[PDB]
Every structure is written in C-alpha cells, then in structure tokens.
C-alpha cells in the first residue's frame, strides 16, 4: 500500500514501594505489531511478533535489545527527574509515555516524522513538524527544552527520522510485502433487531479488514444521518484484522430508505448496503 508508517510506543510505570518501573515497548509497521519488549518477561530481549521480522539476524536482535534497554533506563531517570520538578512525593505511581516514528508516501519517500512525550498522561514535550525544535507544555518541559537545544538533541533525532527510520521501514515493507502491502477489504453485512413493535436497529458490520482505517456512514434518502446513530471504536479481531459496526434506529417498515456506506483502502469504490 502507499502511505506507510513505522511507529514505536513506550510506557514506563513507576513502582514506588520497591524496585524499578514496569517498562513496555511495542513496534508497528502500519497496523501490524512486529516487536515487543516487556521488563516483566523472562527473555529480557526484544522479541519478534511478526514472521517477516524473524528473517533478521543476531546482530539485529542484539542491537535492538541494547537500544530498548537504553530506552528503559532513560525512562527510569526521567521518572525521577520529573517527580523532583513537580515536587511530588515518593508515594504515588507515575507514568511516562513516548511515541515516535516516520511516514512515507506512495513513492516511499519521507513524508513526516514525529516524537511525542507525556508525563502522567499529559503532554510534556514534543518535536515540532519541522523536526528542528520542541513544543514544551509547561515550565518543567521548558527547562528540558533549553537543555535539549544546547545539546542539539533534535538534530540527532531528525537524522534518524529522515534516515534510518524510513530506510528500515522500506526494508520491512519489502520483507513483509505478502502481508504488509496486502489490503484486506472489509467483509460487510447488515443486521436488523427490533427495539419494539415499531422501531428497529439496523447495524452495518465491517469484519476482517486491514488496515484499521475505515469509514462507516449511514444515510437516509442519500443524505448523511448522525442522529439516532451509534458508531463503536474500531477493535481488533485478535488475528491481525479489525472490526467495526455502526447502527441506526429507524421506524419499523422504513428500513429501505436507509443506506450504509463503507469506505476502505481495500475497496476500489465505497460499498453501499441496504436492508
């Protein structure tokens, strides 16, 4: 497919009574998890989660394990530094969350990169779109920004986002092409469930699709309707594919004027479903 991304997500959660934080790292290409690290697990290694990454040799796995442990230690240090800057006690658990990655377009050239960081679920510091400077949310983050400006931290990170990140994304897309560059169009159907003797729910289903991005829209007489509708969050099936539904409540006997449209990358034209 062609727009594509590689993203990493990291969470550390402090354990104030004893020992070091819980650290979880996960890597994705588009909506496919390919690696993980969990500090609670026995291996203490970066682990594969897709068949196409298992191609990579020992030097790869050694390097990713070393780096992911380095990520974990930075998070540990940060949790201490931030507890101090916010004048918090040793009693409570706190969290840091980091996400970074890169996007390429259909031509597989760099489109954009990003790096965001949060403390206790609130924005702390993020790289701006130009990859040259930082957005600091508060005055603790501002101290970090001045430190990182002096140490030219953005310039290093930008090099990765425009360099290694997009190079290795292209590598993985090629190695996993049979799945990563395959679109799985949604399997669609409608169900119909009476709510009373005079109204019914129509539910438009989209199953087994990849990638996760999808749009389901209800229409009445061909115009969009949002009143009396419910749209659930897109959810994982557990087999690598995704599911979603959208429902509308209608007067019984009037089902035929309603249509559900389904848009997805795997469909050349949107689908139209009618009871």
């Amino acid at each position: 497919a062609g727009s594509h991304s590689m993203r990493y997500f990291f969470t550390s959660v402090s354990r104030p009574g004893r020992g070091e934080p819980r650290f979880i790292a996960v890597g994705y290409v588009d909506d496919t998890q390919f690696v993980r690290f969990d500090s609670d697990a026995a291996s203490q290694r970066m682990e594969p989660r897709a068949p196409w990454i298992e191609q990579e040799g020992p030097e790869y796995w050694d390097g990713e394990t070393r780096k992911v442990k380095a990520h974990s230690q930075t998070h540990r240090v940060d949790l201490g530094t931030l507890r101090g800057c916010y004048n918090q006690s040793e009693a409570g658990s706190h969290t840091v969350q980091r996400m970074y990655g890169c996007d390429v377009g259909s031509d597989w050239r760099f489109l954009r990169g990003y790096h965001q960081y949060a403390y206790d679920g609130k924005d702390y510091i993020a790289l701006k779109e130009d990859l040259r400077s930082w957005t600091a949310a508060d005055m603790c983050a501002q101290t970090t920004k001045h430190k990182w400006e002096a140490a030219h931290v953005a310039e290093q990170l930008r090099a990765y986002l425009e360099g290694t990140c997009v190079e290795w994304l292209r590598r993985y897309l090629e190695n996993g092409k049979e799945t990563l560059q395959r679109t799985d169009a949604p399997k669609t159907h409608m169900t119909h469930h009476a709510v009373s003797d005079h109204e019914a729910t129509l539910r438009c289903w989209a199953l087994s699709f990849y990638p996760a991005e999808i749009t389901l829209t209800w229409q009445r007489d061909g115009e969009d309707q949002t009143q009396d509708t419910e749209l659930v969050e897109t959810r994982p099936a557990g087999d690598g594919t995704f599911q979603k539904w959208v429902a509308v409540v209608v007067p019984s006997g009037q089902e035929q004027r309603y249509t559900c449209h389904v848009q997805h990358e795997g469909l050349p034209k949107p689908l139209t479903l009618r009871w």
């Binding site: 990493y8 992911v68 240090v77 702390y124 970090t144 990182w148 140490a151 931290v153 290694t164």
Partner: peptide, 9 residues
Amino acid sequence: NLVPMVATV
C-alpha cells in the same frame, strides 16, 4: 529499528 540514543529530560 529503534532510535540509537534517547536523551534524558
């Protein structure tokens, strides 16, 4: 492929 260095805040 992870970033090679991660600066502390």
